[PDB]
């Protein structure tokens, strides 16, 4: 839940002006305090200056190895119960 | 008054006001006209100061700034006004929605 | 008072008060106005130092820094005031929540 | 008037009107003509300053900027005019649709 | 006392005390106010020492530090005070726990 | 004694006694106080060497290092003291165990 | 005798023994104390030589080394002694066995 | 004989033989001792040349290489001796067998 | 004769002929001993030429090469002889067979 | 004749005849011997130009290029001769067959 969905990073030249122009977030600090949440339809197109960058901060696998541990513990459980 | 502010941006008593009106008309942004006027004023140093940057006569000795330095400074002023024109007219980045009709 | 503080920032008794009011009108932040006034002050060095920056008469000799040097110093003042304005209006990076409506 | 505007973009008194018309008709944009005229003006320094640029007679001393500095300044004027012409005719980037017939 | 320490940092007897109070009010960190005051004192060298950095009269010869050097040193002092302010206010890196409620 | 050691780390009788105590209070490590005091001492050179660093009267000639060189030396002293303080408080890298509770 | 060797590493009678013993106590390695003393002795060129590096009186002319050069050389000596201390205390790389208990 | 060879390497009759024996005891290799002695000898240029390196009296003029050049030469001698010692104790790369006991 | 060739590699009587035997003994390759001897000869310039590189007395004026230049040239000669020694002793690359016994 | 060709490859007869034979025997290629002889000749400038390269007596003035320039020129000659020898003995790249016995 924390990290499965990717997080979009924007290396903007001026974050405050970008927020004010795009999302109308005049006071971004208070927007953070209030817990406000930007709305995106999903279909977006990015017009950036030469120096600005945009990328997705994405994990190879948020679970890591937990499925393997779950398989091992499931084997241990069915062994302990001697359940066919 | 636009003309007075331009004369402040590009010093007075050198050009007559007709070319000032011309510069104002050729660019609505006053700083763009100021940059243009500063370049055109830089052109005039070949007459007002000339090449003879230093001379001694009798016991008099005067060392004026060379023409290259003067035109360089005028160009720098024009560049500053041009950058001002850009920044005034510049707008930050934008992320906008996109959508195509479909059935 | 804004005009007094600007006359402190932009060195005094070179511009009369009406263009100072114009500077205050052109930008809310006083430091941007100070940078603008400093550039416009730097324009003045044409008459003072471009015509003559080092002269000797008889045994009397006087040297002054060239026009390039003084305009460089004034430009440094202008850039410092501009950077001061940007740092005043700058704000740090942000991570915010995002949420789209769904059925 | 295009001739008077060009003669304002150039220092005048060294080009008769015939070559001014020649520059005007050779290049439609006036700034390209100004750059060409400035290069042609820069050519003249081989006579005035190339032959002699610093001389002293008796106690009379006279120094002028060398031919290299003056031709450099004139070339800078020419390049500024050329870049001005390019920015005049410059147009931004474009994204356009594309479509091919099919059945 | 704030004012005495500031007059020690920003060298004394160039400003009167009211603008020093304004400097302290601008930023609670004394070193930031010291940097601001050092810049605004750097602006004053054009009057106190002037651009006439060297002169000879009779058998007297005096070579003062050029205005560029003085303003550069004042800027360096202001930068040092700004860096001191940042280092005083700067905290090192951090690794913290994160947790989201679930079910 | 900390005051005596600090007045050994700087020139002994340029500063009044109370500001030495002030610097000792501001930073616990003596070398940080020495760096601060050295910067503050470096500020003095505008008064003496700034307004005059090289003069000749009659056959008497005297030359002294410019303000830039002296303030550079003082800044070098300040930076050396600061680095000395850092190396005093610096500690090497570490590898430590990690353990989380589990059932 | 450690004090005698330190008074050879750092030249005599710029300090008194009451601080040479202090420097010996500051660091067990004599070369580190020598570097510290060399920096502290470099501080003393403000008085022993002063900024007045060259002067002419009558037919006498003397050109002493500038204070910047002397402090630079003293810093270089201090750096050499510090590097000597490190190399004395430095040990080469190591590959060692590692083992964890297990059943 | 070690002492005579060192007195050949480190230039003669500036250090009494006691500290020569001290340096011989300090470092096993004579060239390391020579580098040490050269670094210590370079300190005398402070007194010898730092306070005066170029003087003219009447028509008599005498110039000597500045303290920086002489200390640079002495440091170069020290570094050459140190590198000579390292090359003496240097040994080439090696490939050796490896074997671990096994049942 | 080895000694004669070495005394050709270094101009005669900067060394007594006895220690040439030592230099030959410490390195069989004559050029290595030549490089060592050239460094040792470079050390001698502080006595033979001293620091006083230029002086004027009466109408006499003499400008000898500075000691830094002479020691630099001697070091360059020593480096050339060392490189000659290496190239004489150096051998090119090799590809050789390798084989391990096996049953 | 090899001796005459070597006395042409080197500036004639600063040496005596026996060392020419010595160099001819030391290296079979004449150009390598010429490079060696040129370095050995370059050693000679110690006395000729190192001791006094520029002197003035009365109105008589005489300047000669410093020892560094002449030893540099001689080194350039030596390097050119060495490169000539290498280019003589150099041979191009090769592709050759390879074959191993097998049954």
PDB file of N, CA, C and O in Angstrom, chain H residues 11, chain I residues 13-15 40-52 64-65 67 70-71, chain J residues 46-47 50-51:
ATOM      1  N   UNK H  11      72.773  19.759   3.390  1.00  0.00           N
ATOM      2  CA  UNK H  11      73.868  20.691   3.134  1.00  0.00           C
ATOM      3  C   UNK H  11      74.564  21.086   4.430  1.00  0.00           C
ATOM      4  O   UNK H  11      73.920  21.316   5.456  1.00  0.00           O
TER       5      UNK H  11
ATOM      6  N   UNK I  13      85.108  19.047 -10.821  1.00  0.00           N
ATOM      7  CA  UNK I  13      85.499  19.185  -9.422  1.00  0.00           C
ATOM      8  C   UNK I  13      84.404  19.770  -8.535  1.00  0.00           C
ATOM      9  O   UNK I  13      84.710  20.503  -7.584  1.00  0.00           O
ATOM     10  N   UNK I  14      83.136  19.470  -8.815  1.00  0.00           N
ATOM     11  CA  UNK I  14      82.104  19.642  -7.801  1.00  0.00           C
ATOM     12  C   UNK I  14      82.110  18.513  -6.776  1.00  0.00           C
ATOM     13  O   UNK I  14      81.451  18.640  -5.738  1.00  0.00           O
ATOM     14  N   UNK I  15      82.827  17.421  -7.045  1.00  0.00           N
ATOM     15  CA  UNK I  15      83.035  16.334  -6.101  1.00  0.00           C
ATOM     16  C   UNK I  15      84.505  15.942  -6.102  1.00  0.00           C
ATOM     17  O   UNK I  15      85.171  15.980  -7.141  1.00  0.00           O
ATOM     18  N   UNK I  40      72.861  15.225  -6.039  1.00  0.00           N
ATOM     19  CA  UNK I  40      73.778  15.694  -5.003  1.00  0.00           C
ATOM     20  C   UNK I  40      74.517  16.956  -5.436  1.00  0.00           C
ATOM     21  O   UNK I  40      74.823  17.815  -4.601  1.00  0.00           O
ATOM     22  N   UNK I  41      74.813  17.080  -6.728  1.00  0.00           N
ATOM     23  CA  UNK I  41      75.436  18.286  -7.257  1.00  0.00           C
ATOM     24  C   UNK I  41      74.455  19.445  -7.237  1.00  0.00           C
ATOM     25  O   UNK I  41      74.835  20.592  -6.973  1.00  0.00           O
ATOM     26  N   UNK I  42      73.185  19.156  -7.523  1.00  0.00           N
ATOM     27  CA  UNK I  42      72.142  20.169  -7.462  1.00  0.00           C
ATOM     28  C   UNK I  42      72.038  20.760  -6.068  1.00  0.00           C
ATOM     29  O   UNK I  42      71.735  21.948  -5.909  1.00  0.00           O
ATOM     30  N   UNK I  43      72.267  19.939  -5.044  1.00  0.00           N
ATOM     31  CA  UNK I  43      72.230  20.467  -3.679  1.00  0.00           C
ATOM     32  C   UNK I  43      73.289  21.544  -3.448  1.00  0.00           C
ATOM     33  O   UNK I  43      73.116  22.400  -2.573  1.00  0.00           O
ATOM     34  N   UNK I  44      74.383  21.528  -4.212  1.00  0.00           N
ATOM     35  CA  UNK I  44      75.509  22.417  -3.948  1.00  0.00           C
ATOM     36  C   UNK I  44      75.307  23.844  -4.448  1.00  0.00           C
ATOM     37  O   UNK I  44      76.154  24.697  -4.166  1.00  0.00           O
ATOM     38  N   UNK I  45      74.231  24.134  -5.184  1.00  0.00           N
ATOM     39  CA  UNK I  45      74.100  25.467  -5.769  1.00  0.00           C
ATOM     40  C   UNK I  45      73.880  26.543  -4.715  1.00  0.00           C
ATOM     41  O   UNK I  45      74.153  27.719  -4.976  1.00  0.00           O
ATOM     42  N   UNK I  46      73.390  26.176  -3.530  1.00  0.00           N
ATOM     43  CA  UNK I  46      73.185  27.175  -2.486  1.00  0.00           C
ATOM     44  C   UNK I  46      74.490  27.812  -2.030  1.00  0.00           C
ATOM     45  O   UNK I  46      74.467  28.938  -1.522  1.00  0.00           O
ATOM     46  N   UNK I  47      75.618  27.124  -2.198  1.00  0.00           N
ATOM     47  CA  UNK I  47      76.923  27.669  -1.841  1.00  0.00           C
ATOM     48  C   UNK I  47      77.615  28.319  -3.034  1.00  0.00           C
ATOM     49  O   UNK I  47      78.179  29.409  -2.908  1.00  0.00           O
ATOM     50  N   UNK I  48      77.577  27.668  -4.196  1.00  0.00           N
ATOM     51  CA  UNK I  48      78.333  28.144  -5.346  1.00  0.00           C
ATOM     52  C   UNK I  48      77.711  29.366  -6.009  1.00  0.00           C
ATOM     53  O   UNK I  48      78.449  30.186  -6.563  1.00  0.00           O
ATOM     54  N   UNK I  49      76.385  29.505  -5.964  1.00  0.00           N
ATOM     55  CA  UNK I  49      75.689  30.587  -6.655  1.00  0.00           C
ATOM     56  C   UNK I  49      74.883  31.416  -5.663  1.00  0.00           C
ATOM     57  O   UNK I  49      74.652  32.609  -5.885  1.00  0.00           O
ATOM     58  N   UNK I  50      74.459  30.804  -4.562  1.00  0.00           N
ATOM     59  CA  UNK I  50      73.718  31.521  -3.542  1.00  0.00           C
ATOM     60  C   UNK I  50      72.387  32.043  -4.059  1.00  0.00           C
ATOM     61  O   UNK I  50      71.983  31.820  -5.199  1.00  0.00           O
ATOM     62  N   UNK I  51      71.698  32.768  -3.177  1.00  0.00           N
ATOM     63  CA  UNK I  51      70.397  33.326  -3.523  1.00  0.00           C
ATOM     64  C   UNK I  51      70.513  34.629  -4.300  1.00  0.00           C
ATOM     65  O   UNK I  51      69.597  34.967  -5.055  1.00  0.00           O
ATOM     66  N   UNK I  52      71.621  35.356  -4.151  1.00  0.00           N
ATOM     67  CA  UNK I  52      71.763  36.696  -4.723  1.00  0.00           C
ATOM     68  C   UNK I  52      71.939  36.573  -6.237  1.00  0.00           C
ATOM     69  O   UNK I  52      73.044  36.589  -6.782  1.00  0.00           O
ATOM     70  N   UNK I  64      72.782  36.720 -12.676  1.00  0.00           N
ATOM     71  CA  UNK I  64      72.989  35.284 -12.728  1.00  0.00           C
ATOM     72  C   UNK I  64      71.651  34.558 -12.715  1.00  0.00           C
ATOM     73  O   UNK I  64      70.619  35.105 -12.320  1.00  0.00           O
ATOM     74  N   UNK I  65      71.676  33.306 -13.162  1.00  0.00           N
ATOM     75  CA  UNK I  65      70.478  32.483 -13.129  1.00  0.00           C
ATOM     76  C   UNK I  65      70.076  32.212 -11.688  1.00  0.00           C
ATOM     77  O   UNK I  65      70.922  31.943 -10.831  1.00  0.00           O
ATOM     78  N   UNK I  67      68.656  30.388  -8.353  1.00  0.00           N
ATOM     79  CA  UNK I  67      68.974  29.055  -7.849  1.00  0.00           C
ATOM     80  C   UNK I  67      67.882  28.062  -8.212  1.00  0.00           C
ATOM     81  O   UNK I  67      68.165  26.881  -8.456  1.00  0.00           O
ATOM     82  N   UNK I  70      68.616  26.754 -11.674  1.00  0.00           N
ATOM     83  CA  UNK I  70      69.748  25.837 -11.731  1.00  0.00           C
ATOM     84  C   UNK I  70      69.396  24.478 -11.140  1.00  0.00           C
ATOM     85  O   UNK I  70      69.737  23.437 -11.718  1.00  0.00           O
ATOM     86  N   UNK I  71      68.717  24.461  -9.991  1.00  0.00           N
ATOM     87  CA  UNK I  71      68.341  23.183  -9.395  1.00  0.00           C
ATOM     88  C   UNK I  71      67.325  22.470 -10.278  1.00  0.00           C
ATOM     89  O   UNK I  71      67.336  21.241 -10.382  1.00  0.00           O
TER      90      UNK I  71
ATOM     91  N   UNK J  46      75.916  25.117 -17.350  1.00  0.00           N
ATOM     92  CA  UNK J  46      76.156  25.439 -15.943  1.00  0.00           C
ATOM     93  C   UNK J  46      77.126  26.595 -15.750  1.00  0.00           C
ATOM     94  O   UNK J  46      76.832  27.563 -15.041  1.00  0.00           O
ATOM     95  N   UNK J  47      78.291  26.502 -16.381  1.00  0.00           N
ATOM     96  CA  UNK J  47      79.347  27.487 -16.207  1.00  0.00           C
ATOM     97  C   UNK J  47      79.173  28.673 -17.146  1.00  0.00           C
ATOM     98  O   UNK J  47      79.354  29.824 -16.740  1.00  0.00           O
ATOM     99  N   UNK J  50      74.728  29.742 -16.874  1.00  0.00           N
ATOM    100  CA  UNK J  50      74.140  29.684 -15.548  1.00  0.00           C
ATOM    101  C   UNK J  50      74.730  30.710 -14.604  1.00  0.00           C
ATOM    102  O   UNK J  50      74.015  31.284 -13.779  1.00  0.00           O
ATOM    103  N   UNK J  51      76.034  30.962 -14.715  1.00  0.00           N
ATOM    104  CA  UNK J  51      76.688  31.895 -13.806  1.00  0.00           C
ATOM    105  C   UNK J  51      76.338  33.342 -14.125  1.00  0.00           C
ATOM    106  O   UNK J  51      76.190  34.154 -13.206  1.00  0.00           O
TER     107      UNK J  51
END
